[PDB]
Design a protein around this nucleic acid. Structure first.
Ligand code: ZN
Ligand code: ZN
Lengths: 155, 245, 120, 44, 273, 80, 137, 16, 62, 211, 344, 43
RNA sequence: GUAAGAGCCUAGCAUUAGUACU
């Protein structure tokens, strides 16, 4: 279901939420945007050429809650393949362990196809993602200038 | 040009490094020569390092920031120049001329959104009347009179002055709005309130309502002035009232 | 250690010994005048006339020593007063050193061979 | 020292908000150029 | 606190006795006094010591001992070539090098996709034979009395005579490093599949193809580099014909796929058909 | 004087906007670009000519522009 | 900050006890829970307080090899130490004196356990494949 | 007879 | 025109003036203006006392 | 660009094909929006902007770098502004004597660390001696494969300090460098320039000195 | 907020000046043969030491002003003096690059702190550690072990002479002001500035701590600023400008701030409101130049009731409160709140 | 996120017999115990 | 006449790493 919005301290960009190939994950992102969950919520893990992880409210990166109360299962397909930048996928700690944490990809990451459930792509504001991947990060890939998600909500 | 060049360059660079380890820190002048020479050699990695070593000695010299950013501008290194400007304007936010030349570089590239963002940062450091006036003239230059009006709002709040208000009202009477110029004089006396009692404020009220052909308004203005103004201040206002009559 | 590490000839502090006493005085004196100069100048005055103020201080010291009254026609009174106060500082120092070395010369206390000439 | 293999005591410009990859490429191209220049033209 | 070492230069033993000589040497690059580590990788080994500073080690992701890269174990050239990165800017001078160091004190190799080139040109099992005694210089001259007892290899030096003069600074920086030169000339030949004197032969032979690779799978392989004229299977030979319409496309297909690419796992060879 | 060279900086500002750019130039650059924010840092879409304009502009400025004892006195007759 | 429900009276929720000079092979809490008996490889027994300083107020020595296992006696004032020097030893805790040293085993006295209800009796099993029961008096 | 013991507050180190 | 700025194995050259000496500090005891002793008193009483004593017993008159 | 589940057979080739970027997981060719993902990403990542709830951008990252990351750097105008909130005796209140005692103790400990380093390390009559005992470490490599350490995972390293000869003279000669640039500069948070009259330009004209 | 907004807040809420009795100068002491440059009061409050350009340190009776003792050991001017509160020690620095520990039970120099490359300008004793801090023309604060004479630390970063120094037990344990116009607040454990304060336009020749508040004052030729600690938050400028280079600043427990000008002015300000209740000019002793009139040091005695000033006419001058004054007979210079709207 | 540079260096404490015994079961014999506690190493 | 240095030829101090093929 279409057009969730992230507006961050670096900018604002908007992602569609894929309905068919992954309904559980998309409903999760929809509703969590709706409830005010992805507010504050700094992009904690930014790796150039790789991804922009976000979604953990605690800022630790260790766990972000879901609408089902905990983990849920992937929706990997032979259809949904991490092929370029801007692909929005969920971050899991292995098979069938998704939380809330997501990552926008900045590059083609084949080596995640089969492990990380895609559910969308950045429809508007790829400039923000390009600028956001090149931000200064520390030895832990943590942005040295906090990149807050000042507000996330569907549109 | 080949390998005879390169060794003349070795010789002159060793000359520069010798002069610079001797005289570099204690008396300026030298890094400008070193950096302009390396710019002549079209070596900009080397010249940027020379400018960075100047600024590592003394960053509070506006002349050096200017020469650095101009080297970078005149060779179309425009993001490099922006970065030099960002640093110069971050570190010496009270040199107006840094801000001017950053704004000018941005509008020469037809980047008026970037020029305007530099104007916003500058207004945050609260410049003089000339800074706010340059911002207003900037927004006029691109025929953006709603933006220039919002800057005038902010301007007369930040520096609450008769100069701010009479300049606001002159802007309006140029702009096409005469009930708004009247509005801005009225608002100057209410908001400014006290300390709007002064000569040139009432002289300007008189001249406005005069070129508005509301001469009864203007008579009320001249009187209410002489009433409120200390008649020590009255000679000029009163001779100008004679000039009205 | 000097053989195997090399001489540490690098920014270790030199004492102010009898042979450096007068030259270090003038170092310190000029540095002091330079302090004052930089603080006395108004905010937008080109801070490079300090070298000519230091030359005026050298001149005023030679004029003190020779008993010559000086009056530079266009010297700011602040700069001139600074020069007079530091020439008087040097004059006090030099006269007190002369008093001291005269008492040593009179006693017979050990003085250098040049101290006798300098004191005369 | 060799002041044409290396940049003497190189102080690289510090990173800013603007990406200077392209500027660096242009500088290298300029360095690559070898137009004839007299000593007077190079010293000014 | 621990050397930064190639895990070949620690030998087979999971247990390492290593001597820690703090201030035991000068870095062979930064000329800096540093903490040396010395150890015997294994029982057939000699005692190897670290050759460079710990920092100067972890700058270029190289072992403190062999000065080879840490991920792939190939000289700093071969890795810099496949990394495509600029020549070393780092100052060769030691006044310059120490100034760069004292700067970087007071205030790119881990985030790359594994380069197939380096992976293709690396050793599968560890070169433990690099951790072994030098050659007995008295056995060379025929004058070794130590017999089989010699702790030094009782063989003769069998080495390229332009090699055996390698420079530390050059193997660390990447300039005229004869070993990586030999290696890149090797890959230059292997990247040199002979385009024959016949200009019009527009077909490439694909041999050694295991049977689970189908003709449209090899078509998916070769369509990228140009138009195919016809692809022809024959699993009897486990081989294939592929003709294109333009020579330069078959040239592309030789040049990219000459250094033994693997289609869906099968180690397959290419030839000019 | 900073006021003198300030009206000369405004000389240069209005002159160069009259010399290098036009109103439909500006407004169609904008019409391509909705954000005229939070986009700071990312270089904006503008014609590659603009750059040399600045350069040429400033370069324009450029073409507008004993021994030591002689200078000394030449300061004093100047003053005295 | 972080205010997570302090359970005990200890100054901090994680306290490291240092002062030993060898492996620490066995430890024991006093029955009244305000003492620590730590037996190290250094053939020595540290006595720590569980609260308010964690002060090792006594180091009892007297074994010639690693004190492998320590329990307290049911009242907490007498200690049973078992070692590798073939000698199990009863000590008085408050005092710093050894009470009764029995060394009947032929090899390292690995394990011991004193009886918790009844008399002052403890079992000790050592390397000789013999498990011996030991009454105090 | 205080012995050569100290107790100091320290976090527990973690390998990751 | 500009002084040298003085920013900061170790060298094993040992100066003669750097050999151990005066290796313990004197502290102010009870009786030498120690800090705990001086909170106890009113220093203004003693100052005005001493100043009055000086200023009268130099004037020589009651 | 065709919407969700409307893209079968429609493949992008150029930047302009993405609209405002993003890439398509349904498609199975590598896409490159905005030319992101072209080899290496460049050099020297840029500083980030920080924007408020309300949209006020922060450009401090220019000035808050290197050693300035750590310290108090006054960057804005509100640092220049008189603070009335803060002038009461109760607002300017020294820390708790307990915290000050902890600071005094920590500082004494660090300063005695340094002073004893300067005393001992630099003293050469300290007689050199025996071998710094073995310390074990467990070292887990970056690259562990069943061929490295012969199929073992980690390594225990016996780190044995070798004893230095007492007769070994100072081993390394000392090197000379110019001092580096220093910590990064800090904004000069001055009040507006006060205008030099031409008068006060002339009452600081210093005549040349004629000796 | 703004300069306008804050100016209106300031017109409404500025702390009013606390009435302070005027001070009068009651004693000149002649006898130094050069500019008196430093003062230091002994913690017992019964003698003070003054160092001079005549290279001596004189010990004076605080109640009679009597020369108790002259100490010669510096080769050049004595520029800084610090009497220890915890040790029977006096510390002097001088233009001779030398820092000396005087044993006041011997009246002799027992330790020397070697290492300044130029003349030393400032000195400070850590109040709780046995550590001293000196700054000089080499732009560096050298942190010394009092006992071992070892240079424990060098605080680097200033660019010109470190002219003023503060030492406290809380962090920042050293505050320096320099001729490079900045104030550095130092982290003494790390050897690093914890803050650099660039609000001054001229060189910071005087620092002073508030005796009781976590706040210090810095003084330039252009402003006296007041700063909150630990972080060096600018509190405000004094509500007037002594139009002088301020060489010395002392703060009282009543909050009398005394600032002493290079022109021999002495202004007394209300700490806490920033308002100067007194303005004096020095009289120079007979023979002096009126150019030779600066006020190089000032300290309050330990009670706060005496101010001892070290002057360039080579006198020590002593000031006491005219404390038989009442807010009616003696209000001094009267206060108008900062009613203006200005730019900051 | 790692400790050393090329891996994780962690302190260890054993009794000295164990380092030497394992170091020489592998060292001399070729085959010894993995120090991780996972089986044995080598041939 | 100092005595300084530049260079030329020939000119005995430090080092232990690195050497492959489907
Ligand atoms: Zn290795
Ligand atoms: Zn042999």
């Amino acid at each position: 279901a279409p057009l969730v919005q992230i507006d961050t301290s670096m900018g604002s960009f908007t992602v569609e939420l894929y309905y068919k190939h992954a309904p559980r994950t998309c409903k999760n992102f929809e509703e969590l945007a709706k409830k005010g969950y992805y507010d504050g919520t700094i992009f904690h893990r930014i790796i150039r050429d790789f991804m922009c992880q976000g979604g953990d409210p605690t800022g630790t990166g260790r766990g972000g809650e879901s609408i089902y109360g905990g983990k849920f299962e992937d929706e990997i397909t032979r259809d949904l393949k991490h092929t370029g930048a801007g692909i929005l996928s969920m971050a899991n700690s292995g098979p069938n362990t998704n939380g809330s944490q997501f990552f926008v990809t900045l590059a083609p990451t084949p080596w995640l196809d089969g492990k990380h459930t895609i559910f969308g792509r950045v429809t508007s504001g790829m400039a923000v993602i390009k600028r956001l991947g090149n931000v200064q990060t520390d030895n832990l890939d943590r942005p040295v200038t906090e990149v807050k998600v000042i507000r996330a909500r569907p549109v | 040009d080949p390998e005879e060049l390169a060794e003349y360059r070795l010789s002159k660079r060793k000359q520069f490094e010798d002069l610079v380890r001797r005289v570099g820190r204690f008396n300026g002048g030298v890094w400008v020569k070193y950096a302009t020479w390396e710019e002549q050699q079209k070596d900009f990695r080397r010249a940027r390092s020379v400018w960075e070593r100047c600024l590592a000695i003394e960053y509070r010299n506006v002349s050096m920031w200017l020469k650095y950013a101009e080297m970078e501008m005149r060779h179309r290194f425009v993001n490099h120049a922006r970065n030099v400007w960002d640093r110069a304007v971050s570190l010496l936010p009270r040199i107006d001329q840094l801000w001017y030349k950053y704004i000018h570089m941005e509008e020469m590239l037809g980047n008026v959104a970037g020029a305007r963002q530099v104007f916003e940062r500058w207004m945050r450091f609260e410049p003089d009347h000339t800074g706010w006036m340059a911002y207003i003239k900037f927004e006029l230059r691109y025929n953006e009179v709603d933006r220039a009006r919002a800057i005038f709002e902010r301007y007369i709040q930040i520096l609450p002055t008769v100069k701010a208000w009479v300049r606001y009202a002159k802007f309006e009477m140029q702009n096409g709005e005469v009930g708004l110029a009247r509005r801005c004089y009225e608002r100057a006396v209410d908001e400014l309130g006290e300390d709007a009692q002064t000569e040139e404020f009432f002289i300007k009220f008189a001249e406005f309502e005069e070129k508005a052909r509301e001469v009864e308004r203007a008579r009320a203005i001249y009187r209410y002035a002489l009433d409120h103004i200390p008649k020590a201040s009255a000679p000029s206002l009163y001779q100008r009232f004679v000039a009205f009559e | 250690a000097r053989q195997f590490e090399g001489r540490q000839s690098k920014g270790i502090a030199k004492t102010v010994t009898k042979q450096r006493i007068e030259s270090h005085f003038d170092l310190e004196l000029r540095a002091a005048v330079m302090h004052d100069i930089l603080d006395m100048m108004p905010e937008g005055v080109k801070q490079n006339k300090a070298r000519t103020i230091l030359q005026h201080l050298s001149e005023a010291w030679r004029c003190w020593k020779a008993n010559i009254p000086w009056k530079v026609p266009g010297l700011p009174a602040p700069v001139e007063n600074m020069i007079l106060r530091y020439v008087k500082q040097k004059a006090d120092w030099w006269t007190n050193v002369a008093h001291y070395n005269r008492e040593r010369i009179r006693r017979g206390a050990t003085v250098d061979k040049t101290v006798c000439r300098k004191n005369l | 020292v060799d002041y044409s293999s290396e940049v003497a005591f190189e102080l690289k410009p510090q990173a800013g908000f603007y990406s200077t990859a392209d500027e660096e490429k242009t500088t290298r191209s300029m360095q690559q150029e070898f137009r004839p220049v007299t000593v007077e033209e190079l010293e000014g | 606190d621990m050397p930064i070492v190639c895990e070949t230069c620690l030998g087979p033993n999971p247990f390492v006795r290593m001597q820690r000589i703090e201030f035991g040497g000068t870095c062979h690059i930064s000329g800096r006094p540093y903490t040396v580590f010395r150890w015997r990788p294994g029982n057939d080994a000699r005692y190897k010591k670290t050759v460079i500073c710990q920092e100067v080690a972890k700058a270029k992701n190289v072992c403190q001992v062999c000065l080879l890269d840490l991920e792939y174990g190939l000289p700093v050239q071969v890795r810099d070539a496949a990394m495509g990165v600029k020549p070393d800017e780092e100052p060769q001078s030691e006044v310059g090098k120490e100034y760069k160091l004292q700067m970087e004190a007071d205030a790119s190799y881990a985030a790359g996709r594994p380069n197939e080139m380096l992976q293709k040109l690396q050793r599968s099992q560890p070169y433990y034979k690099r951790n072994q005694a030098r050659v007995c210089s008295f056995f060379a001259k025929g004058q070794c009395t130590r017999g089989a007892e010699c702790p030094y290899r009782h063989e003769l030096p069998t080495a390229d005579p332009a090699l055996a003069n390698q420079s530390y600074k050059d193997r660390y920086y990447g300039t005229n490093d004869p070993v990586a030169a030999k290696m890149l000339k090797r890959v230059d030949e292997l990247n040199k599949l002979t385009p024959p004197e016949d200009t019009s032969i527009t077909t490439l032979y694909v041999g050694g193809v295991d049977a689970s690779i189908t003709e449209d799978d090899v078509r998916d392989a070769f369509y990228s580099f140009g138009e195919l004229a016809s692809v022809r299977k024959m699993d009897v030979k486990s081989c294939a014909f592929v003709t294109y319409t333009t020579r330069s496309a078959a040239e592309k297909a030789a040049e990219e796929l000459g250094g033994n690419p693997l289609i869906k796992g099968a180690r397959v060879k290419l030839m000019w058909g | 004087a900073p006021e003198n060279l300030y009206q000369a900086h405004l000389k240069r500002a209005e002159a160069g906007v009259a010399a290098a750019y036009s109103v439909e130039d500006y407004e169609r650059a904008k019409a391509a670009d909705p954000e005229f924010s939070l986009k700071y840092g990312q270089q904006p879409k503008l014609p590659a000519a603009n750059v040399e304009k600045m350069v040429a502009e400033l370069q324009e400025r450029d073409r507008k522009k004993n021994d030591r004892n002689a200078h000394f006195n030449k300061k004093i007759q100047r003053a005295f | 900050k972080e205010g997570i429900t302090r359970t005990s009276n200890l100054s901090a929720p994680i306290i490291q006890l240092s002062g030993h000079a060898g492996e620490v092979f066995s430890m024991r809490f006093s029955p009244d829970g305000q003492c620590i008996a730590s037996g190290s490889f250094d053939k020595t027994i540290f006595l720590w307080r569980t609260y308010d300083e964690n002060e090792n107020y006594n180091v009892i020595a007297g074994h010639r090899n690693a004190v492998l296992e320590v329990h307290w006696f049911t009242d907490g004032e007498a200690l049973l130490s078992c070692s590798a020097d073939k000698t199990a030893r009863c000590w008085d805790a408050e005092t710093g004196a050894p009470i009764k040293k029995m060394g009947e085993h032929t090899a390292v006295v690995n394990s011991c356990c004193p009886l918790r209800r009844g008399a002052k009796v403890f079992v000790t099993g050592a390397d000789d494949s013999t498990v011996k029961v030991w009454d105090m008096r | 007879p205080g012995g050569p013991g100290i107790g100091r507050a320290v976090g527990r180190g973690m390998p990751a | 025109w500009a002084p040298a700025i003085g920013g900061e194995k170790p060298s094993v050259q040992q100066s003669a003036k750097n050999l151990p000496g005066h290796t313990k500090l004197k502290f102010r005891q009870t009786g030498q203006a120690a800090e705990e002793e001086l909170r106890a008193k009113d220093l203004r009483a003693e100052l005005e006392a001493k100043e009055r004593k000086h200023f009268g017993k130099q004037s020589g008159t009651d | 660009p065709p919407p969700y589940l409307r893209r079968k057979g429609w493949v992008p080739r150029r930047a302009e094909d993405f609209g405002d970027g993003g890439a398509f997981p349904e498609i199975h060719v590598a896409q490159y929006p905005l030319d992101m993902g072209k080899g290496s990403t460049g050099g020297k990542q840029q500083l980030a902007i920080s924007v408020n709830e309300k949209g006020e951008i922060n450009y401090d990252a220019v000035v808050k770098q290197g050693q300035n990351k750590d310290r108090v750097v006054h960057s804005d105008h509100g640092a220049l502004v008189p603070k009335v909130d803060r002038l009461s005796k109760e607002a300017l209140a020294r820390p708790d004597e307990e915290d000050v005692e902890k600071t005094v103790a920590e500082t004494a400990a660090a300063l005695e660390r340094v002073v004893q380093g300067k005393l001992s390390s630099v003293n050469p009559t300290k007689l050199p001696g025996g071998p710094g005992g073995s310390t074990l470490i467990k070292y887990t490599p970056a690259q562990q494969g069943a061929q490295y350490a012969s199929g073992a995972g980690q390594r225990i390293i016996k780190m044995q300090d070798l004893p230095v000869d007492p007769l070994e003279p100072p081993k390394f000669r000392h090197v000379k460098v110019p001092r580096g640039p220093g910590s990064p500069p800090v904004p000069v948070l001055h009040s507006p320039p006060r205008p030099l009259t031409v008068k006060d330009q002339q009452d600081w004209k210093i005549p040349p000195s004629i000796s | 907020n703004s300069s306008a907004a804050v100016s209106r807040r300031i017109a409404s809420k500025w702390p009013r000046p606390v009435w302070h009795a005027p001070w009068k100068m009651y004693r000149v002491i002649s006898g130094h043969l050069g500019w008196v440059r430093c003062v230091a009061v002994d913690p017992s409050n019964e003698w003070f030491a003054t160092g001079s350009a005549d290279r001596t340190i004189k010990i004076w009776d605080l109640a009679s002003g009597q020369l108790k003792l002259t100490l010669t050991g510096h080769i050049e001017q004595v520029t800084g003096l610090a009497v220890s509160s915890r040790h029977p020690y006096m510390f002097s620095c001088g233009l001779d690059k030398m820092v000396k520990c005087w044993d006041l039970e011997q009246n002799k120099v027992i330790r020397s702190y070697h290492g300044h490359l130029s003349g030393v300008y400032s000195i400070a004793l850590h109040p709780n550690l046995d550590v001293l801090m000196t700054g000089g023309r080499d732009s560096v604060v050298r942190v010394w072990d009092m006992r071992t004479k070892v240079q424990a630390m060098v605080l680097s970063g200033h660019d010109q002479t470190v002219c003023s120094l503060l030492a406290q037990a809380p962090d920042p344990q050293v505050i320096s002001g320099s001729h490079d116009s900045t104030i550095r607040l130092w982290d003494l454990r790390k050897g690093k500035a914890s803050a650099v304060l660039t609000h001054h336009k001229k060189s910071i020749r005087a620092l002073a701590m508030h005796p009781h508040e976590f706040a210090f004052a810095s003084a330039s030729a252009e402003n006296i600023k007041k700063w909150a600690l630990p972080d060096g938050d600018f509190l405000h400028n004094m509500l007037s400008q002594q139009r002088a280079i301020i060489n010395s600043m002392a703060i009282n427990q009543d909050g009398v701030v005394a600032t002493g000008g290079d022109n021999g002015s002495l202004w007394l300000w209300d700490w806490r409101s920033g308002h100067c209740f007194q303005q004096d000019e020095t009289v120079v002793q007979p023979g002096s130049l009126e150019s030779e009139g600066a006020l190089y040091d000032m300290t309050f005695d330990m009670t706060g009731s005496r101010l001892i000033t070290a002057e360039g006419d080579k006198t020590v001058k002593m000031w006491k409160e005219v404390e038989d004054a009442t807010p009616e007979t003696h209000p001094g210079l009267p206060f108008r709140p900062p009613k203006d709207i200005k730019r900051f | 996120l790692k400790n050393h540079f090329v891996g994780h260096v962690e302190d260890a404490h054993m009794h000295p017999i164990h380092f030497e015994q394992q170091y020489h079961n592998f060292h001399a014999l070729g085959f010894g115990e993995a120090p991780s506690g996972i089986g044995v190493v080598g041939k």
